[PDB]
Amino acid sequence: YFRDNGKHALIIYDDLSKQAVAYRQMSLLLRRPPGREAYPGDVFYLHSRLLERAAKMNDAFGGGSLTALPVIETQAGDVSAYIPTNVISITDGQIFLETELFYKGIRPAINVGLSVSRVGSAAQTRAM
Amino acid sequence: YFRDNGKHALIIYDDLSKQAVAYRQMSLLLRRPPGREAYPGDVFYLHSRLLERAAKMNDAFGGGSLTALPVIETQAGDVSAYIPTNVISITDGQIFLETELFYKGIRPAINVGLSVSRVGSAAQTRAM
Amino acid sequence: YFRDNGKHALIIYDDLSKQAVAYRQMSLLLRRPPGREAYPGDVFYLHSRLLERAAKMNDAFGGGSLTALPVIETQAGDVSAYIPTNVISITDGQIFLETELFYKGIRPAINVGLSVSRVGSAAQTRAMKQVAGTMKLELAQYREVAAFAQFGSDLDAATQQLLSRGVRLTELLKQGQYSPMAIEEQVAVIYAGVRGYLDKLEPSKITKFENAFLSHVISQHQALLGKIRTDGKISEESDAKLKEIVTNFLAGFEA
Amino acid sequence: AGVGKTVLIMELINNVAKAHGGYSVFAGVGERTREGNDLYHEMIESGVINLKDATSKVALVYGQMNEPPGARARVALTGLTVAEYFRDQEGQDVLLFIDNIFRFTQAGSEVSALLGRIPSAVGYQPTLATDMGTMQERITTTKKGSITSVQAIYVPADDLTDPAPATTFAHLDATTVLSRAIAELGIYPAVDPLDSTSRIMDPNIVGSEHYDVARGVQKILQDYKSLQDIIAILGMDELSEEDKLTVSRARKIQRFLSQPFQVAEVFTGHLGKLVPLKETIKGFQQILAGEYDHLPEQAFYMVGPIEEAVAKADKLAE
Amino acid sequence: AGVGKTVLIMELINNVAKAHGGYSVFAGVGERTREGNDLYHEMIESGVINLKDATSKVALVYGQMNEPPGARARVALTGLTVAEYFRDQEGQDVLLFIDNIFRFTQAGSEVSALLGRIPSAVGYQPTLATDMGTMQERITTTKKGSITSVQAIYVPADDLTDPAPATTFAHLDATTVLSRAIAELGIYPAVDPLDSTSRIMDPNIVGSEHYDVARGVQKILQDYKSLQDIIAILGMDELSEEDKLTVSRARKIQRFLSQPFQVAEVFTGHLGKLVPLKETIKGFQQILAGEYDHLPEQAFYMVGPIEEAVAKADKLA
Amino acid sequence: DPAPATTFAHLDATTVLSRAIAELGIYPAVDPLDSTSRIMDPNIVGSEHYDVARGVQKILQDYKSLQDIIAILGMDELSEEDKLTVSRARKIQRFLSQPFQVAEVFTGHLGKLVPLKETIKGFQQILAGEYDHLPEQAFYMVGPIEEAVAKADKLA
Amino acid sequence: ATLKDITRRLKSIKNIQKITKSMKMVAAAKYARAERELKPARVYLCGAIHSSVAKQMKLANIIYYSLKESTTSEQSARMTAMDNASKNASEMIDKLTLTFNRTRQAVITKELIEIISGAAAL
Numbered sequence A, B: 001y002f003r004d005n006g007k008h009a010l011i012i013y014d015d016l017s018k019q020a021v022a023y024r025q026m027s028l029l030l031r032r033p034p035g036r037e038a039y040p041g042d043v044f045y046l047h048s049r050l051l052e053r054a055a056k057m058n059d060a061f062g063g064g065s066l067t068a069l070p071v072i073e074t075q076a077g078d079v080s081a082y083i084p085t086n087v088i089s090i091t092d093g094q095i096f097l098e099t100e101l102f103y104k105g106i107r108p109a110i111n112v113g114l115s116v117s118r119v120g121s122a123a124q125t126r127a128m
Numbered sequence C: 001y002f003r004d005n006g007k008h009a010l011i012i013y014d015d016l017s018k019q020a021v022a023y024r025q026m027s028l029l030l031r032r033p034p035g036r037e038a039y040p041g042d043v044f045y046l047h048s049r050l051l052e053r054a055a056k057m058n059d060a061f062g063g064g065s066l067t068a069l070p071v072i073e074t075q076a077g078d079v080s081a082y083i084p085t086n087v088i089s090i091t092d093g094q095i096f097l098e099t100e101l102f103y104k105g106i107r108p109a110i111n112v113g114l115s116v117s118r119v120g121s122a123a124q125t126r127a128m129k130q131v132a133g134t135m136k137l138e139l140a141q142y143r144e145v146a147a148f149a150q151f152g153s154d155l156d157a158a159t160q161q162l163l164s165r166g167v168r169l170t171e172l173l174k175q176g177q178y179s180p181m182a183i184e185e186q187v188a189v190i191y192a193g194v195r196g197y198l199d200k201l202e203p204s205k206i207t208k209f210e211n212a213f214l215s216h217v218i219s220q221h222q223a224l225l226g227k228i229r230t231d232g233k234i235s236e237e238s239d240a241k242l243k244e245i246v247t248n249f250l251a252g253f254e255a
Numbered sequence D: 001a002g003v004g005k006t007v008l009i010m011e012l013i014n015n016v017a018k019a020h021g022g023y024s025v026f027a028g029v030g031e032r033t034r035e036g037n038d039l040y041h042e043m044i045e046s047g048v049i050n051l052k053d054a055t056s057k058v059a060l061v062y063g064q065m066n067e068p069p070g071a072r073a074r075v076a077l078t079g080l081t082v083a084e085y086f087r088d089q090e091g092q093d094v095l096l097f098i099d100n101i102f103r104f105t106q107a108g109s110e111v112s113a114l115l116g117r118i119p120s121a122v123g124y125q126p127t128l129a130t131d132m133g134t135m136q137e138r139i140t141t142t143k144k145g146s147i148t149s150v151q152a153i154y155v156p157a158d159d160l161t162d163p164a165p166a167t168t169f170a171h172l173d174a175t176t177v178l179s180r181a182i183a184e185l186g187i188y189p190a191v192d193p194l195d196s197t198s199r200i201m202d203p204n205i206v207g208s209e210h211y212d213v214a215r216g217v218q219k220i221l222q223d224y225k226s227l228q229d230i231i232a233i234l235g236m237d238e239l240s241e242e243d244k245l246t247v248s249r250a251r252k253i254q255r256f257l258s259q260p261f262q263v264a265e266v267f268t269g270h271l272g273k274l275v276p277l278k279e280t281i282k283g284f285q286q287i288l289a290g291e292y293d294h295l296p297e298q299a300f301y302m303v304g305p306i307e308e309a310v311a312k313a314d315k316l317a318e
Numbered sequence E: 001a002g003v004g005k006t007v008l009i010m011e012l013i014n015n016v017a018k019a020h021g022g023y024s025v026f027a028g029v030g031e032r033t034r035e036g037n038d039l040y041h042e043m044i045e046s047g048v049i050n051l052k053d054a055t056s057k058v059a060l061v062y063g064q065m066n067e068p069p070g071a072r073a074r075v076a077l078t079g080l081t082v083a084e085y086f087r088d089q090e091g092q093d094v095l096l097f098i099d100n101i102f103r104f105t106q107a108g109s110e111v112s113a114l115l116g117r118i119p120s121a122v123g124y125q126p127t128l129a130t131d132m133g134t135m136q137e138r139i140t141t142t143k144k145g146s147i148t149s150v151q152a153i154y155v156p157a158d159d160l161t162d163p164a165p166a167t168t169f170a171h172l173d174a175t176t177v178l179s180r181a182i183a184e185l186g187i188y189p190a191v192d193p194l195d196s197t198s199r200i201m202d203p204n205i206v207g208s209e210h211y212d213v214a215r216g217v218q219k220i221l222q223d224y225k226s227l228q229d230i231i232a233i234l235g236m237d238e239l240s241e242e243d244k245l246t247v248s249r250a251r252k253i254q255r256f257l258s259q260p261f262q263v264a265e266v267f268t269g270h271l272g273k274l275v276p277l278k279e280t281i282k283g284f285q286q287i288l289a290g291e292y293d294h295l296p297e298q299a300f301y302m303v304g305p306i307e308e309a310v311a312k313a314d315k316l317a
Numbered sequence F: 001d002p003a004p005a006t007t008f009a010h011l012d013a014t015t016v017l018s019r020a021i022a023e024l025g026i027y028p029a030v031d032p033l034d035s036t037s038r039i040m041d042p043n044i045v046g047s048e049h050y051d052v053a054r055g056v057q058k059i060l061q062d063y064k065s066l067q068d069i070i071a072i073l074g075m076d077e078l079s080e081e082d083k084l085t086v087s088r089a090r091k092i093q094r095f096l097s098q099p100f101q102v103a104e105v106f107t108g109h110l111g112k113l114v115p116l117k118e119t120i121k122g123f124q125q126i127l128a129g130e131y132d133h134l135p136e137q138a139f140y141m142v143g144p145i146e147e148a149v150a151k152a153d154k155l156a
Numbered sequence G: 001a002t003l004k005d006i007t008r009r010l011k012s013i014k015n016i017q018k019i020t021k022s023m024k025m026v027a028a029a030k031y032a033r034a035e036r037e038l039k040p041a042r043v044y045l046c047g048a049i050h051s052s053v054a055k056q057m058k059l060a061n062i063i064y065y066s067l068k069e070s071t072t073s074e075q076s077a078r079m080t081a082m083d084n085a086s087k088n089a090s091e092m093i094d095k096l097t098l099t100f101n102r103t104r105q106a107v108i109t110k111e112l113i114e115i116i117s118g119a120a121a122l
């Protein structure tokens, strides 16, 4: 609604892991056959559809925007697993946090090597 | 019969691991859904309802008792596997036999440090 | 057709991994019960009935034969996966290839420690047997010490020689593509290494040596190459003539 | 996910396609829409696409992530059919860029259970390899015209053995493998020198000096690779002055492998460099020969030709 | 392979037949046609089979690799039936060779899979334990006699904890470990004396004497093995009285564990030896004591009874 | 495992017990880097508490990363700085242990109920290096830091 | 856990085991000679060796005696260090092989079970 009326909105989806669990439940109960990790085959599409809706509009369309910050919970720190990688392959980058950095005192526990932005300096001011 | 009639019995289940595999053969042939190590979800109940039956009656029920010494075979000292932890979570302690102590000639090869007895002290003789 | 009519045939199945995927596809679409990696229960029987047809016929059945070289592609070194496990048990032995040897300079990337031939010498000429037996023992010794190499900063002369033979021989095992050599040329170059003549030549040069030495014996010493076959082995003469050749040549090579 | 496939293919369109004489086709399959808008507008600017007349040299076909499975499973065939036309009805050298052909396979698995099929390994449809083969075999040069296809190929959970990527390998003639492990070090493009191959990398084709330099680089990198974990624990003090000396050049070669892309200026914060084949060979030849043993590793990180690393070496003084 | 397996089997046949009267049965589970024919023709040449006169001591049952899984799962049973006849009807002590037990499990798995059953851990059939126990229990000592089974084992992925091997371990009583290392030392049979084990190696079964000797040999051999390190590095020059005796004795025992197989004759040109259990115990017992320390290593190498060690020695001077 | 994993989101404080800790003799077998609390915030427990708790956790994590090295070469290759962390971390690990009244039978010690202030104090001091002169076992199975000393003396 | 990972670590830690083993043998040889020359001379990473002398650090005759004692000690120390370090590596190899085989078996079972579930829901 903001997006399409020249306003700007931000949405946090905390967290999409639980959402995929609820979908898996509903799908399985609907008698749809389970795939990888018991999750339905279109789990990518469940998140893909969703996240593509966050966008920057042009001036002809009002120049509003929807920015998204989906959150994913990993297990034992594996960013290379099915689901995680599903969502990494959707968004425009990711901020990876880690308990080890967290306890060493690096808070925010951002892991610089694994985190990225697919937008880069185009999203920063000249100063920064 | 002994337990409920004022007498004392000791049963030895040698071994529960092999029982758990026969029950798994029944369950997969019935097409019950496999989980850890392909065992059915009720393998815990299989042993729990069994071992709960070994008990100590008070004087109003005749004072009898039934003592149980179930036996579990591990694979390469893996006491963190499904079945081993299951029986550990039912019984009142364990006596660990190490493959290392045995082969080194220590017999009986008991690992005093990992063996426990949750309720045995009270029943140990004052002499000891 | 060749096997049953006194002829000999060689068949390469490249790959059997893909034949198995094809079969698996049909099996799952026909709704047959799937198993490990979703393969059907008779997937072993697919390959077994195939490979067994490979065979050495007796004289009464013409003496023809069918040799078979099946190919199997493993995933990230997994020789215990399902199709590999099966084809490794059906065959008489394997030639194992490794990425790590490949990029190190070892090509063909054959792993000498893991490859095997249950037939072995039964199908190897006497000349090759001779030199190969020494090389197999030397390389085996080399493998055991090979790790101490880059950190053994005081290795004794004994273990230090094992290393030198080892690097020398590994270099003589390297071979360019599309250039299969005759058996007499193989014993000649191996001879060089197993007799210690190249123990002084610097490893980086051994590859250039072999190529020069081989081209030379091919040209001037045909008669010595034929003798190596005739005698079946390395005769006492061939053994002295080779000593004269490689010594002189080597000397020229490092002039 | 996030290792550089798209940046790299963008670089390729920038260099090879902008100078390409002939038509080009780009099929966005199962990928970001924003990227579609990015590319479109960038091509209008370079004139590759002209909206005011008939000079356009690139046709576009899109079927991104926001679409349903049926679309994503068919777009690639849409892109491919357009390209085919140019090829057969002209013979003209056609360039084909597809990002990301994995989405044809993922789309299929998505509807596989509703089609009634028993799953195969890792959840995929049983017709994976057949499905992929009837498509890929259309993507080919023929005697009538030639297609130079560049396909970005996603690798699920970073596992190159996954059914999808693993089956795609045999369809190619040159494969460029990207590693998150390398990218994580800051080396870009994140190419794995010990996992990228090409059918034309043969001395009787690229010639001897090219072949030998390449083979020598991979060897020094594979040596180092196998020591890393070892000296990580034992220490470097036992490595002979010859061994530890190779560790130096390995490291420089490793860094000399990076390269600022024109296309990645927003991420590197560096001006894009582009290096000619011959200067490439010379730079690496030279490093292998101990020549630049006197320069600091960092001089080699993120430059173009070898001369820039020498320069940087000086600038590193203060 | 290449560790003298076919030769060991052939000896065992011949040795049990001479000293016990009982025959042997050879069950080829998923035999490779090639190796089968080779094992046939090798049997004929060794004499364990006779294509003419009824001296044949072994019956062969072959379930080849080309056959469907049902056939290869049944062959150990067919061979088991043949063996059962000599037990229950002739009162003999039959020997049953199963090559190899792993291929009997796999055929089991393949059969169940075609039957449409949900597979268990690591892919094997649900009935893995039962399929195994119904075949193995038929292998016992009964009132009329007994079947003893020598069965080749393949360990999948080198993992001893794999359902397949761990199942088979439940039924074995002893293991004969053949090693290429030992073969390489020219020790024949290539039996590794420290790895091969037996359940009946208890005094209560083989007697206190047999037990103590066995332990003595195993010990002297473990000590020697350990000394190797010092011997090479610190030099075999500072070994105390007790230390040099161990090394010399150990090497005599080690070499005394070799033995010319009666089946080897055809090539070795040397008369095969069959050593009675008394000579074996006594033999090693005396070496341990040091009674024969005054003899050269080569005296015990490829001999028979202890007597032949001294004999050979005097001749070798 | 699905069960425990789904259960974490339903708690405000979690105490994750460990088999590897318990086997070391540490009881309660709490994992000091896996048990958390929503109250562990400077505006709720106060800055002194928050700081000490973050201090202990950092020295335990630092020790943990060194374990990869320790395992093969042992402590001989550690900097003097590293060893310092290894000594204190080991004194923190043991001082986290505590005799429970309900476990008297298995510990063979009287039970201890340590007040918060006394818990902060002892940990602060170990962090400061105040007891870098006491032997590790002194800090095992005691109550307040004072008993650590007393036990040390007894050891002499 | 990860098969890729464990495999890698095992390749490393197996190498280390052999290298360390060899360094124990070299040290042992050097020490042997030294020990012999010990008494005679008294008439005129290397464990905590370097560590000790340095931490406490805060003609001819003396030089010769000191150096002789020091070499013996050093090679002794190093021999012990390596002996322990190769031992540590061995135990860790064994422990990792176990972990590799557990993971290996679970992975196989897990993929099996997913395949069956998806077949049975048809």
Ligand SMILES: Nc1ncnc2c1ncn2[C@@H]1O[C@H](COP(=O)(O)OP(=O)(O)O)[C@@H](O)[C@H]1O
Residues within 6 Å of the ligand: A116, A117, A118, A119, A120, D001, D002, D003, D004, D005, D006, D007, D008, D188, D189, D190, D261, D264, D267, D268
């Ligand atoms: N050549 C490069 N130089 C610098 N950064 C790069 C380069 N390639 C990729 N990256 C960084 O990594 C991110 C992921 O890139 P991208 O190509 O979109 O990933 P994918 O491999 O998923 O297609 C980029 O946004 C950028 O931040």
Ligand SMILES: [Mg+2]
Residues within 6 Å of the ligand: D005, D006, D007
């Ligand atoms: Mg991309």
